Design a protein around this nucleic acid. Structure first.
Length: 162
DNA sequence: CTTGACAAAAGTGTTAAATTGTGCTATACT
């Protein structure tokens, strides 16, 4: 369940607070619907209360989960196919998937490769867009704007952030 | 109208940088 003021995630919307629940008229009878808003978008969202766990509606990590993610961010890697197709495809799916542990785990190998040989014009967006959801997630949990939030990664990276 | 001495300009040769030309990947899709 999600109360009015719960801090949640709605892929790929990064983070947003739930405003409440309402009966939206969809087709036939109106099932209950959760409401996820994003002030840094001015968008809007309606999430069915039936199976919230099927839309990948997770919740912002707690301040306790910062170090673990950082540790899997600095070191943790993972092999990927050589031809750009499968590799970038996988990375993309992982991105839209909305999984901070997987996005960070990915960011690790992507980082190891970026300063070695160097990152293709594709995997670059697959890195940037990856660090984006992270930097904002940190801003949701620790309530510190993308300035400070991005200032976090600098430690477990070795370099600053864009 | 003539030498000798010189610096600038125009050559001549080998390189580092860049720019351009190519083959190719594999779920299935007719």
């Amino acid at each position: 369940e999600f109360r009015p003021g719960d801090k949640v995630v709605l892929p790929p919307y990064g983070v947003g607070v739930v405003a409440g629940i309402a009966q939206r008229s969809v087709s036939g009878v109106s099932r209950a619907y959760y409401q996820v808003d994003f002030p840094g978008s001015r968008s809007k969202a309606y999430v069915p209360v039936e199976a919230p766990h099927s839309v990948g509606l997770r919740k912002a990590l707690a301040p306790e989960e910062v170090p673990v993610i950082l540790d899997l961010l600095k070191n943790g890697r993972m092999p990927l196919p050589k031809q750009w197709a499968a590799r970038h495809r996988k990375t993309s799916e992982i991105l839209a998937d909305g999984n901070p542990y997987r996005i960070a785990q990915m960011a690790g190998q992507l980082r190891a490769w970026e300063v070695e040989r160097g990152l293709p014009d594709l995997d670059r967006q697959a890195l940037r867009r990856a660090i984006h959801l992270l930097a904002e997630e940190v801003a949701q949990s620790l309530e510190i704007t993308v300035q400070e939030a991005k200032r976090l990664f600098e430690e477990a990276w070795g370099e600053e952030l864009n």
